[PDB]
Amino acid sequence: SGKRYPPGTSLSRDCNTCICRNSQWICSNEECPGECLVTGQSHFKSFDNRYFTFSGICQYLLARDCQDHSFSIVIETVQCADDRDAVCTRSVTVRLPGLHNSLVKLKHGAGVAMDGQDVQLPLLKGDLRIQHTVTASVRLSYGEDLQMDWDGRGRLLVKLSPVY
């Protein structure tokens, strides 16, 4: 990045580590977790660090396990101001076939609803934990291979580990 380092040093990217030997950083190739992101109006980010935009108004899929069916997430988009080029996120739905085949719903506040029933946070069921983070943002956590973030005013995140 335009600065020098002596040999034998080991700087660490978020993903993995790299070490200087004979003017050649050696590096590992071990996978590291991805992050799909929704924010702003309609600005997406793929797991592969792509950016793009799609201002559609319907219930779209966002992610899904596709060789088995451990989960499936569904965004719901609406126009969100007077302009036509302003399509923010209202609510996202989550689905776990591994537990009752239930149906979680993050709502436009900091609220959540399991099968129509509003719920106080925290919600320790067997696997999934749902709790506030700063007392202004929800955080789902199914297992150890899944996280989420608030869909109140539309800043949905995910965290998928390399098992997927």
Partner: protein
Amino acid sequence: ACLEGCFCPPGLYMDERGDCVPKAQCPCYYDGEIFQPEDIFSDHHTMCYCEDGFMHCTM
């Protein structure tokens, strides 16, 4: 009935977060969903917005 407790003056209405507020920033609870005081809002076929506490839908 005419009950006893902790209220606040008539110009102020109760917010979720312990304070009470005028009806300018009093949100809407449409379909459960807590919309902020200014949230223009529509599918393809309906048209809806939250003005001052009430949820003004049309078609």
